[PDB]
Amino acid sequence: HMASKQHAHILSLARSMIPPLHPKLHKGQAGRIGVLGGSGDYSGAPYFSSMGAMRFGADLAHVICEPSAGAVIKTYSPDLIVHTILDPQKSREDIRSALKGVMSRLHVLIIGPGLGRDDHMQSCAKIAFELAKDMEQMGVVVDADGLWLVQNEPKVVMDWPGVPRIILTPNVMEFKRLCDTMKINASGPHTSLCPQLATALGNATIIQKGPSDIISNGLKIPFALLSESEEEQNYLEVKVEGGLKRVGGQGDILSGSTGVLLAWGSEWVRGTYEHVGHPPPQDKAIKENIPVLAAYGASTFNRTVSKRGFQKKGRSMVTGDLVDMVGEVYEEVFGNPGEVEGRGKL
Amino acid sequence: HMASKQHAHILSLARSMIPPLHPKLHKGQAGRIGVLGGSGDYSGAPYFSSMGAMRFGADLAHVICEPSAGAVIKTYSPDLIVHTILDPQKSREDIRSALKGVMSRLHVLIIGPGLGRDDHMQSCAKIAFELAKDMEQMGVVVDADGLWLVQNEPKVVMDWPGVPRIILTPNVMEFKRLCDTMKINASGPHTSLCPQLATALGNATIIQKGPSDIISNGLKIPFALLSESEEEQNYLEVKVEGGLKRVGGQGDILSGSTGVLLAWGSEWVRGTYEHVGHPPPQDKAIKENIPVLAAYGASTFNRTVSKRGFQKKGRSMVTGDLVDMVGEVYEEVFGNPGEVEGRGKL
Ligand code: NA
């Protein structure tokens, strides 16, 4: 009853973030997304995240990776811009300098897909975190072994300037490790753990991936989003049915679409889309909660694309099948409803 | 008459091994499969086996190979996890250590596709055999030049701990060589050679590939499987019609699907699927004969996918065409019959 009303309401707020396809927009204004990862043999995950982002709607998707992984990733698609700049035969300052150059052309950096845990790549991600901190209009999505870095040095996300702009997407074990680091007692109420962790990490937005996804920034969900004399819940729960085939890169589809929605919503609040009929929202609660809306919309989208792929492929489904279906499922969840709602060609 | 009854019966037992697609299962529980091979120029076979396994239904398929072959294999699919750890510029203990790390995350290792006969790769396979022996819940499928190693050192399969968990898939010449090594007289009754060889190799399960496939572990096929006052046959014969176009990697499709069925059946007997409605079988004969059931189901499947590909492509068919058809033929042989039998979404 009220749960489907609330789900539809929050999804419509996420849809409000999406710029119209419009003659006055030029290349880049609908999102420049980067993926930092691709170490050694781990070249699938950064492809799934970056190509997922491109098929979802980024104008430009970049991969920032090691040379060996980058050579493979480039063969998967000429549309990806692959920067093989995380060369372990390069000085740390030379890597900082190259990373800063690429990052200065990004709206959002997804840290983690194929990152691994070795010292070189963990240092590269830490440099990326440090640079993104000081680029006040940069958003960050952190996944996979990017979250290994956060659990080892939580300060890399704590105390950032500008609007909040960080989304973490831990699986079950990554979530447990983050909770352990931040002294969050596992015996607490199940739906209170993610809000406590987000609070402990400075109100970053966290997608606690699970049978359902629990999404929180540790703050009550303001009246603009959550649906009496009681306080608004401090978490949202996505129970959208996904598919049953567990593909290895499902989480990279999530991070890529999360990054795009984060970029769109952040540019929206900044005013970039005002001249094409999408002015920023009046409500400051919406501005403060862009990462929650991006996370909620991406979680919803990710489950739906998993479901639609599974309906098509069944037991045989692999993550690569989902990449081909991102576009048609985007039209289902966001594009056609938004156009019919009068938001323009979404 | 009774032959089609028996074929249908044994296939239904193999279908009983397959876990349901189910919300309570998570990534990995429906099979982590590895392929050890890919030496020098021989990168097609390990792709066909690992991608065959993924399209058949493994959650995760890994390739363990040399760097040069691995670089090519990665370009074929971002969904394969390719470990380029069999570097001949690496110490033997460093290779043992890397192999153990990867193998500790596998249910089944398929040794042989693109392995070759050179000293380095034969040693890598022997290390893999030694490690798998001591990982009591690991299954092994041995094909192609993996069987060259067995004919040179048969003890690598003899006297293993745990449930039986080895399947050999020799072609005609590999079968003749194994028989020669184990002193099996070629003048014996044709259907007695495979049971004698399996017995000599410690009741490993052997798929004697041929016009028909003769499958044996050297033991009588227990009452749970084989269909009076006479003893149950000690071999099964798959006469399922295959296609007529001899593609180079047909045997890799077989080994990949064999590995998946072996993983499913082994986890099934272990109890992993009890909580989703597939408890282990009551009959200990079924538990002891998982490798025979996996071999029988895979042999059946392999012929059917060859037939269906040939119906579609005729003279032009190549192995790559079969990879694309694994999913639809799995639904034909296993998925839809099993669902209609009430086993859940298979
Ligand atoms: Na290619």
XYZ file of C-alpha atoms and ligand atoms in Angstrom:
693
model
C 0.000 0.000 0.000
C 2.000 2.949 1.340
C 5.205 1.070 0.420
C 4.468 1.137 -3.307
C 3.411 4.791 -2.991
C 6.701 5.628 -1.317
C 8.730 3.605 -3.827
C 7.035 5.337 -6.750
C 7.503 8.751 -5.077
C 11.231 8.365 -4.453
C 11.764 6.998 -7.966
C 10.029 10.063 -9.382
C 12.425 12.306 -7.422
C 15.358 10.359 -8.883
C 13.801 10.835 -12.350
C 13.785 14.593 -11.692
C 17.609 14.515 -11.672
C 17.892 13.383 -15.300
C 18.661 16.119 -17.840
C 16.530 16.189 -20.976
C 18.073 15.187 -24.256
C 18.042 18.636 -25.781
C 19.658 20.488 -28.708
C 21.218 23.074 -26.383
C 23.258 20.499 -24.450
C 26.679 19.607 -25.802
C 29.065 16.714 -25.354
C 29.919 16.140 -21.704
C 27.074 18.009 -20.041
C 25.116 14.765 -19.502
C 27.968 13.202 -17.561
C 31.692 12.491 -17.598
C 32.214 9.320 -15.566
C 35.459 7.587 -14.601
C 36.183 4.118 -13.221
C 39.419 3.633 -11.285
C 40.494 0.003 -11.133
C 41.678 -2.650 -13.579
C 44.694 -4.208 -11.856
C 46.594 -7.193 -13.236
C 44.146 -9.819 -14.448
C 40.976 -8.002 -13.244
C 39.731 -6.314 -16.404
C 36.084 -7.459 -16.531
C 34.731 -5.452 -13.584
C 35.965 -2.014 -14.785
C 34.553 -2.749 -18.238
C 31.156 -3.682 -16.790
C 31.025 -0.525 -14.670
C 32.220 1.896 -17.375
C 30.269 0.362 -20.246
C 27.252 0.082 -17.940
C 27.588 3.812 -17.300
C 27.859 4.563 -21.029
C 24.820 2.479 -21.946
C 22.891 3.986 -19.022
C 23.523 7.480 -20.346
C 26.941 8.979 -19.529
C 28.247 11.130 -22.384
C 31.823 9.968 -21.730
C 33.099 7.031 -19.683
C 36.765 6.758 -18.751
C 38.694 3.839 -17.311
C 41.800 4.592 -15.223
C 43.846 1.437 -14.868
C 47.126 -0.447 -15.208
C 48.597 -0.917 -18.717
C 48.082 -4.699 -18.915
C 44.425 -4.605 -17.901
C 43.892 -1.493 -20.007
C 45.125 -3.220 -23.155
C 42.356 -5.827 -22.754
C 39.650 -3.345 -21.772
C 40.302 -1.252 -24.888
C 39.623 -4.294 -27.082
C 36.130 -4.622 -25.572
C 34.960 -1.227 -26.811
C 36.308 1.710 -28.852
C 33.781 3.922 -27.089
C 35.530 3.655 -23.688
C 38.375 6.103 -23.014
C 41.004 3.974 -21.310
C 43.847 5.724 -19.471
C 46.637 3.239 -18.762
C 48.224 5.678 -16.335
C 48.448 3.530 -13.173
C 51.765 2.169 -14.275
C 53.721 0.704 -11.322
C 56.880 1.655 -13.269
C 55.900 5.308 -12.674
C 56.694 7.604 -9.792
C 53.952 8.315 -7.286
C 53.976 12.019 -8.093
C 53.818 11.220 -11.813
C 50.748 9.099 -11.065
C 49.196 11.827 -8.927
C 49.823 14.293 -11.770
C 48.297 12.013 -14.432
C 45.339 11.134 -12.198
C 44.673 14.810 -11.474
C 44.686 15.582 -15.214
C 42.086 12.919 -15.986
C 40.007 13.589 -12.867
C 39.805 17.312 -13.656
C 37.640 16.268 -16.638
C 35.222 14.108 -14.605
C 31.948 14.653 -12.758
C 32.122 11.341 -10.830
C 34.829 8.752 -10.178
C 33.865 5.158 -9.386
C 36.718 3.745 -7.290
C 37.088 -0.005 -6.959
C 36.054 -2.163 -9.962
C 38.979 -4.558 -10.448
C 41.066 -2.443 -8.052
C 42.426 -5.336 -6.002
C 44.204 -5.155 -2.659
C 47.840 -4.822 -3.680
C 49.855 -1.891 -2.374
C 50.229 -0.100 -5.708
C 46.552 0.065 -6.588
C 45.474 0.796 -3.017
C 47.845 3.768 -3.050
C 46.469 4.887 -6.425
C 42.937 4.800 -5.027
C 44.048 6.736 -1.953
C 45.557 9.419 -4.215
C 42.277 9.450 -6.116
C 40.322 9.888 -2.846
C 42.619 12.748 -1.796
C 42.238 14.531 -5.147
C 38.465 14.047 -5.242
C 38.176 15.459 -1.726
C 39.696 18.721 -2.924
C 37.693 18.870 -6.191
C 34.564 20.126 -4.528
C 32.220 19.330 -7.461
C 33.437 15.717 -7.864
C 31.284 12.794 -6.784
C 32.631 9.403 -5.782
C 31.127 5.906 -5.799
C 33.176 3.306 -3.916
C 32.825 -0.426 -4.564
C 34.636 -3.750 -4.125
C 38.249 -3.272 -2.958
C 37.772 0.469 -2.894
C 35.887 -0.401 0.286
C 38.894 -2.389 1.486
C 40.736 0.952 1.484
C 37.909 2.673 3.412
C 37.822 -0.048 6.050
C 41.600 0.327 6.427
C 41.570 4.161 6.416
C 38.030 5.444 7.028
C 39.252 9.047 7.138
C 39.571 9.001 3.329
C 35.790 9.567 3.229
C 35.377 11.548 6.488
C 35.191 15.387 6.537
C 34.812 16.444 2.906
C 34.045 19.972 1.634
C 31.093 20.894 -0.562
C 27.779 19.105 -0.896
C 27.811 15.443 0.213
C 28.922 13.394 -2.756
C 30.011 9.897 -1.692
C 28.189 6.586 -2.159
C 29.508 3.262 -0.835
C 28.117 -0.037 -2.194
C 29.319 -2.825 0.148
C 28.332 -6.424 -0.266
C 27.629 -8.472 2.872
C 31.245 -9.117 3.896
C 32.434 -5.610 2.976
C 29.566 -4.227 5.052
C 30.493 -6.395 8.013
C 34.115 -5.259 7.775
C 33.159 -1.569 7.655
C 30.917 -2.053 10.702
C 33.779 -3.770 12.556
C 36.160 -0.898 11.789
C 33.695 1.781 12.913
C 32.777 -0.139 16.113
C 29.174 -0.729 14.999
C 27.680 -3.555 17.065
C 26.317 -6.324 14.839
C 23.652 -7.260 17.413
C 21.751 -4.010 16.813
C 18.459 -3.892 14.900
C 19.096 -5.017 11.335
C 17.770 -1.854 9.684
C 19.726 0.349 12.101
C 23.191 -0.889 11.075
C 23.474 0.943 7.770
C 22.299 4.314 9.228
C 24.756 3.907 12.124
C 27.612 3.163 9.705
C 26.731 6.073 7.435
C 26.656 8.341 10.493
C 30.022 6.999 11.676
C 31.439 7.693 8.192
C 30.269 11.313 8.196
C 26.846 10.750 6.565
C 28.194 9.216 3.381
C 25.418 7.413 1.526
C 25.678 3.648 1.812
C 23.912 0.967 -0.223
C 23.886 -2.062 2.082
C 23.469 -4.674 -0.630
C 21.337 -7.642 0.314
C 18.143 -9.583 -0.364
C 16.759 -6.101 -0.141
C 19.075 -3.092 -0.376
C 19.134 -0.809 2.669
C 20.101 2.751 1.745
C 21.033 5.396 4.301
C 23.087 8.517 4.880
C 22.388 8.309 8.605
C 19.935 11.213 8.544
C 16.170 11.045 8.677
C 14.751 10.928 5.149
C 13.362 14.454 4.831
C 9.730 15.324 4.169
C 10.530 15.908 0.493
C 11.334 12.178 0.139
C 9.856 9.988 2.887
C 6.109 9.564 3.332
C 2.726 12.155 10.994
C 3.659 12.838 14.615
C 6.520 10.384 13.921
C 9.967 11.069 12.523
C 10.759 10.095 8.956
C 12.608 6.800 8.690
C 16.375 7.139 8.466
C 16.788 4.442 5.819
C 15.136 3.367 2.592
C 14.718 -0.232 1.497
C 14.681 -1.361 -2.133
C 12.794 -4.639 -2.473
C 12.482 -4.544 -6.278
C 12.623 -8.113 -7.577
C 15.889 -8.939 -9.344
C 16.784 -11.984 -11.357
C 17.836 -15.301 -9.846
C 21.075 -15.897 -11.781
C 24.011 -14.576 -9.772
C 26.316 -13.016 -12.381
C 29.813 -11.983 -11.335
C 29.619 -8.331 -12.342
C 26.122 -7.373 -11.166
C 27.675 -4.986 -8.669
C 29.545 -3.196 -11.458
C 26.301 -2.562 -13.309
C 25.111 -1.015 -10.033
C 28.173 1.186 -9.557
C 28.130 2.446 -13.139
C 24.473 3.428 -13.061
C 24.949 4.898 -9.587
C 27.761 7.069 -10.888
C 25.667 8.377 -13.770
C 22.677 9.240 -11.589
C 25.026 10.935 -9.099
C 26.547 13.032 -11.892
C 23.158 13.993 -13.337
C 21.701 14.908 -9.947
C 24.764 16.889 -8.923
C 24.800 18.908 -12.153
C 21.045 19.379 -11.803
C 21.339 20.903 -8.331
C 24.264 23.047 -9.580
C 21.978 24.660 -12.193
C 23.537 23.145 -15.320
C 20.152 22.057 -16.687
C 18.175 25.226 -15.857
C 18.484 26.563 -19.414
C 16.915 23.372 -20.833
C 13.906 23.514 -18.499
C 15.197 21.581 -15.450
C 16.033 24.235 -12.819
C 17.418 23.074 -9.458
C 14.868 21.946 -6.863
C 13.490 24.498 -4.435
C 13.860 22.132 -1.477
C 17.328 22.061 0.088
C 16.535 18.568 1.391
C 16.589 17.299 -2.204
C 19.955 19.003 -2.785
C 21.420 17.406 0.344
C 20.010 14.017 -0.645
C 21.170 13.649 -4.254
C 23.423 10.695 -3.314
C 20.496 8.896 -1.652
C 18.300 9.466 -4.713
C 21.045 8.281 -7.077
C 21.585 5.212 -4.899
C 17.841 4.446 -4.698
C 17.301 4.863 -8.444
C 20.399 2.802 -9.308
C 19.460 0.012 -6.864
C 15.980 -0.067 -8.406
C 17.415 -0.033 -11.908
C 20.007 -2.717 -11.139
C 17.383 -5.163 -9.873
C 15.135 -4.489 -12.868
C 17.914 -5.034 -15.406
C 18.927 -8.227 -13.576
C 15.289 -9.386 -13.744
C 14.895 -8.527 -17.429
C 18.172 -10.224 -18.353
C 17.203 -13.308 -16.392
C 13.819 -13.465 -18.120
C 15.728 -13.484 -21.410
C 18.690 -15.749 -20.590
C 17.806 -17.842 -17.529
C 20.574 -20.106 -16.236
C 22.904 -19.059 -19.058
C 22.942 -15.332 -18.204
C 26.299 -13.587 -17.812
C 27.029 -9.973 -16.921
C 27.856 -9.131 -20.519
C 24.197 -9.869 -21.380
C 23.119 -7.161 -18.944
C 25.267 -4.515 -20.643
C 23.293 -5.020 -23.854
C 20.019 -4.599 -21.986
C 20.853 -1.477 -19.956
C 19.431 0.829 -22.633
C 16.055 -0.851 -22.997
C 15.640 -1.159 -19.219
C 16.603 2.488 -18.775
C 13.806 3.374 -21.183
C 11.420 1.224 -19.075
C 12.339 2.624 -15.654
C 13.327 6.207 -16.436
C 13.078 7.256 -20.068
C 9.484 6.604 -21.085
C 7.897 7.431 -17.674
C 9.862 10.685 -17.554
C 8.893 11.698 -21.065
C 5.225 10.989 -20.322
C 5.567 13.028 -17.113
C 6.509 16.030 -19.270
C 10.230 16.086 -18.343
C 11.342 16.053 -21.982
C 13.092 13.297 -23.874
C 14.853 11.427 -21.035
C 12.379 -50.166 -25.173
C 14.173 -50.648 -21.851
C 17.110 -48.634 -23.254
C 15.081 -45.438 -23.581
C 13.581 -46.083 -20.132
C 17.050 -46.424 -18.655
C 18.363 -43.364 -20.506
C 15.451 -41.251 -19.290
C 15.880 -42.601 -15.731
C 19.588 -41.816 -15.466
C 19.053 -38.366 -16.986
C 16.412 -37.656 -14.352
C 18.917 -38.576 -11.615
C 21.422 -36.159 -13.169
C 18.663 -33.502 -13.207
C 18.223 -34.083 -9.462
C 21.747 -32.698 -8.922
C 20.900 -29.231 -10.260
C 20.207 -26.559 -7.631
C 17.114 -24.424 -8.137
C 17.523 -20.817 -9.117
C 16.337 -19.376 -5.841
C 16.437 -16.041 -3.974
C 18.247 -17.605 -1.007
C 21.266 -18.679 -3.071
C 24.070 -16.173 -3.500
C 26.928 -15.742 -5.931
C 29.126 -18.829 -6.088
C 26.789 -21.402 -4.583
C 25.761 -22.655 -8.050
C 29.348 -23.428 -8.987
C 32.872 -22.032 -9.092
C 34.642 -23.762 -11.979
C 38.268 -23.485 -13.093
C 40.039 -24.536 -16.289
C 43.787 -25.154 -16.103
C 45.467 -24.935 -19.493
C 46.140 -22.252 -22.094
C 49.798 -22.762 -23.016
C 51.568 -20.811 -25.751
C 49.353 -20.609 -28.818
C 46.561 -22.875 -27.450
C 43.986 -20.377 -26.222
C 40.801 -21.610 -27.944
C 40.268 -24.827 -25.967
C 40.359 -23.223 -22.474
C 37.952 -20.538 -23.680
C 35.527 -23.142 -25.036
C 35.613 -25.131 -21.794
C 35.306 -22.152 -19.419
C 32.756 -20.214 -21.454
C 30.872 -23.469 -22.044
C 30.751 -23.904 -18.272
C 29.525 -20.329 -17.764
C 26.779 -20.613 -20.371
C 25.798 -24.026 -18.982
C 25.284 -22.528 -15.539
C 28.445 -22.018 -13.455
C 28.233 -18.861 -11.339
C 31.950 -18.167 -11.860
C 34.374 -19.631 -14.394
C 38.116 -19.154 -14.006
C 40.917 -19.813 -16.463
C 44.382 -20.607 -15.068
C 46.940 -20.216 -17.818
C 50.155 -18.714 -19.171
C 50.323 -14.915 -19.657
C 50.447 -14.957 -23.478
C 47.445 -17.243 -23.897
C 45.649 -15.450 -21.075
C 45.950 -12.086 -22.810
C 44.018 -13.502 -25.790
C 41.454 -15.384 -23.710
C 40.561 -12.226 -21.776
C 39.686 -10.465 -25.040
C 37.088 -13.156 -25.812
C 34.970 -12.400 -22.751
C 34.953 -9.978 -19.795
C 32.882 -12.524 -17.892
C 35.755 -15.047 -17.623
C 38.172 -14.604 -14.707
C 41.570 -15.244 -16.254
C 44.528 -15.893 -13.939
C 47.777 -15.551 -15.885
C 49.674 -17.202 -13.050
C 51.397 -20.082 -14.894
C 54.280 -17.852 -15.783
C 57.393 -19.893 -16.693
C 59.418 -16.913 -15.393
C 58.090 -17.790 -11.911
C 59.450 -20.156 -9.310
C 57.714 -23.487 -8.866
C 56.792 -22.691 -5.276
C 55.449 -19.296 -6.362
C 53.280 -21.142 -8.888
C 52.146 -23.673 -6.294
C 51.262 -20.774 -3.977
C 49.308 -18.882 -6.663
C 47.558 -22.055 -7.837
C 46.560 -22.936 -4.273
C 45.089 -19.446 -3.787
C 42.899 -19.710 -6.883
C 41.999 -23.367 -6.327
C 40.873 -22.670 -2.753
C 38.001 -20.703 -4.348
C 36.899 -23.503 -6.712
C 34.468 -26.418 -6.565
C 35.906 -28.180 -9.655
C 39.077 -27.819 -11.720
C 39.113 -28.945 -15.353
C 42.731 -29.859 -16.131
C 43.851 -30.069 -19.739
C 42.203 -27.677 -22.250
C 45.131 -26.175 -24.174
C 47.531 -27.615 -21.580
C 50.026 -29.051 -24.058
C 52.827 -31.506 -23.346
C 55.732 -29.216 -22.511
C 57.530 -29.661 -19.206
C 56.357 -26.406 -17.629
C 52.643 -26.936 -18.122
C 52.811 -30.647 -17.311
C 54.447 -29.715 -14.008
C 51.773 -27.070 -13.378
C 49.056 -29.669 -13.927
C 50.840 -32.101 -11.616
C 50.934 -29.416 -8.900
C 47.239 -28.853 -9.536
C 46.549 -32.607 -9.177
C 48.526 -32.711 -5.916
C 46.656 -29.718 -4.470
C 43.250 -31.020 -5.560
C 44.002 -34.382 -3.956
C 44.388 -32.678 -0.590
C 41.351 -30.373 -1.006
C 38.861 -33.057 -0.150
C 35.799 -31.199 -1.526
C 37.406 -30.412 -4.917
C 36.338 -32.237 -8.060
C 38.532 -32.707 -11.107
C 37.764 -33.279 -14.791
C 40.778 -34.303 -16.882
C 40.882 -33.867 -20.660
C 43.286 -33.643 -23.609
C 46.932 -33.396 -22.472
C 45.857 -33.593 -18.861
C 45.428 -37.252 -19.785
C 48.967 -37.283 -21.170
C 50.063 -36.571 -17.587
C 47.864 -39.386 -16.204
C 49.214 -41.899 -18.701
C 52.745 -40.857 -17.698
C 52.037 -40.820 -13.929
C 48.788 -42.677 -13.190
C 49.311 -42.295 -9.439
C 48.240 -38.635 -9.715
C 44.640 -39.926 -9.772
C 45.085 -43.088 -7.647
C 44.256 -43.165 -3.895
C 42.414 -39.916 -3.185
C 40.631 -38.980 0.071
C 36.973 -38.013 0.342
C 34.133 -38.938 -1.976
C 35.208 -39.994 -5.493
C 35.519 -36.845 -7.551
C 37.517 -37.469 -10.739
C 36.263 -37.737 -14.325
C 38.534 -38.517 -17.287
C 37.354 -37.797 -20.857
C 39.790 -39.560 -23.236
C 39.372 -39.574 -26.967
C 40.219 -42.771 -28.863
C 44.014 -42.402 -28.843
C 44.154 -41.074 -25.268
C 42.029 -44.045 -24.213
C 44.327 -46.480 -25.979
C 47.358 -44.916 -24.297
C 45.789 -45.119 -20.828
C 44.917 -48.781 -21.439
C 48.509 -49.471 -22.532
C 49.907 -47.855 -19.380
C 47.581 -49.779 -17.055
C 48.231 -53.111 -18.856
C 44.633 -53.405 -20.098
C 44.508 -55.904 -22.966
C 42.946 -54.361 -26.075
C 41.596 -57.744 -27.233
C 39.065 -57.851 -24.385
C 35.340 -57.281 -24.939
C 34.838 -53.743 -26.207
C 32.472 -52.663 -23.429
C 34.744 -54.170 -20.767
C 37.768 -51.955 -21.506
C 36.514 -48.759 -19.901
C 35.368 -50.513 -16.665
C 38.733 -52.308 -16.457
C 40.610 -49.017 -16.909
C 38.472 -47.200 -14.354
C 39.104 -50.050 -11.908
C 42.850 -49.926 -12.601
C 42.771 -46.158 -11.948
C 41.062 -46.556 -8.573
C 37.438 -46.302 -9.797
C 37.798 -42.862 -11.326
C 34.906 -42.174 -13.684
C 35.911 -42.381 -17.326
C 34.034 -41.164 -20.399
C 35.374 -43.348 -23.213
C 34.477 -41.005 -26.052
C 33.388 -42.696 -29.246
C 30.560 -43.257 -31.719
C 28.758 -43.939 -28.498
C 30.264 -42.840 -25.181
C 31.011 -45.627 -22.700
C 30.936 -44.377 -19.110
C 32.243 -46.386 -16.167
C 33.783 -46.139 -12.722
C 34.520 -49.861 -12.765
C 31.738 -50.677 -10.304
C 28.367 -52.186 -11.064
C 25.817 -49.427 -11.668
C 23.808 -49.607 -8.444
C 20.089 -50.316 -8.220
C 19.395 -46.598 -7.789
C 20.662 -46.010 -11.357
C 20.685 -49.131 -13.547
C 17.487 -50.925 -14.533
C 16.689 -59.268 -11.959
C 18.727 -62.287 -10.869
C 21.531 -60.615 -12.876
C 24.064 -58.041 -11.752
C 23.678 -54.442 -12.848
C 25.857 -53.549 -15.813
C 29.168 -51.953 -14.892
C 29.069 -49.366 -17.675
C 26.584 -46.983 -19.238
C 26.442 -46.154 -22.927
C 25.300 -42.802 -24.314
C 24.028 -43.212 -27.868
C 22.356 -39.787 -28.106
C 22.647 -38.563 -31.692
C 25.149 -35.728 -32.111
C 25.781 -33.557 -35.114
C 27.874 -34.609 -38.098
C 30.250 -31.625 -38.308
C 33.430 -32.402 -36.387
C 34.327 -29.113 -34.674
C 37.725 -28.791 -33.019
C 36.539 -27.889 -29.530
C 33.591 -30.258 -29.061
C 35.491 -31.986 -26.279
C 35.884 -28.688 -24.423
C 32.134 -28.152 -24.456
C 31.950 -31.620 -22.882
C 34.538 -30.916 -20.190
C 32.987 -27.588 -19.221
C 29.491 -28.994 -18.836
C 30.919 -32.036 -17.055
C 32.643 -29.772 -14.564
C 29.457 -27.847 -13.826
C 27.350 -30.966 -13.294
C 30.099 -32.401 -11.065
C 30.118 -29.224 -8.964
C 26.323 -29.116 -8.668
C 26.047 -32.794 -7.752
C 28.872 -32.602 -5.234
C 27.386 -29.564 -3.480
C 23.989 -31.265 -3.593
C 25.239 -34.371 -1.789
C 27.091 -32.113 0.698
C 23.772 -30.507 1.726
C 24.341 -27.041 0.253
C 20.940 -27.025 -1.462
C 18.869 -28.491 1.401
C 17.635 -25.056 2.504
C 16.250 -24.345 -0.994
C 14.308 -27.620 -1.165
C 16.930 -30.000 -2.635
C 18.175 -32.113 0.307
C 20.859 -34.742 -0.365
C 19.656 -38.104 -1.693
C 18.817 -40.842 0.777
C 20.638 -43.481 -1.274
C 24.391 -43.663 -0.671
C 24.750 -45.201 -4.140
C 23.730 -41.849 -5.646
C 26.303 -40.056 -3.471
C 29.053 -42.444 -4.576
C 28.004 -42.075 -8.212
C 27.832 -38.297 -8.655
C 30.756 -38.373 -11.131
C 28.990 -41.012 -13.249
C 25.776 -38.966 -13.267
C 27.649 -35.771 -14.168
C 29.469 -37.629 -16.940
C 26.247 -39.199 -18.280
C 24.330 -35.909 -18.234
C 27.221 -33.987 -19.829
C 27.733 -36.634 -22.545
C 24.003 -36.478 -23.296
C 24.051 -32.694 -23.290
C 27.176 -32.484 -25.459
C 25.660 -34.650 -28.194
C 22.403 -32.683 -28.114
C 24.132 -29.307 -28.391
C 26.283 -30.669 -31.236
C 23.093 -31.861 -32.973
C 21.255 -28.569 -32.463
C 24.224 -26.523 -33.676
C 24.586 -28.734 -36.722
C 20.892 -28.371 -37.547
C 21.459 -24.611 -37.503
C 24.867 -24.308 -39.196
C 25.529 -27.499 -41.171
C 28.930 -27.708 -42.860
C 29.864 -24.217 -41.664
C 29.548 -24.960 -37.926
C 32.457 -24.075 -35.641
C 32.809 -24.599 -31.901
C 32.123 -20.940 -31.205
C 28.591 -21.491 -32.583
C 28.003 -24.125 -29.910
C 28.891 -21.731 -27.087
C 26.016 -19.474 -28.138
C 23.615 -22.410 -28.111
C 24.559 -23.960 -24.755
C 21.885 -21.970 -22.911
C 18.958 -22.889 -25.134
C 19.992 -26.558 -25.224
C 20.391 -26.581 -21.447
C 16.805 -25.360 -21.202
C 15.758 -28.219 -23.545
C 17.584 -31.048 -21.767
C 17.575 -29.923 -18.140
C 15.855 -26.626 -17.416
C 12.311 -27.007 -18.710
C 11.939 -30.754 -17.898
C 13.208 -30.112 -14.371
C 10.878 -27.192 -13.790
C 7.910 -29.237 -15.021
C 9.019 -32.076 -12.722
C 8.575 -29.694 -9.775
C 12.309 -29.189 -9.055
C 12.023 -25.397 -9.178
C 13.431 -23.021 -11.749
C 16.397 -25.033 -13.097
Na 37.936 -8.625 -29.773
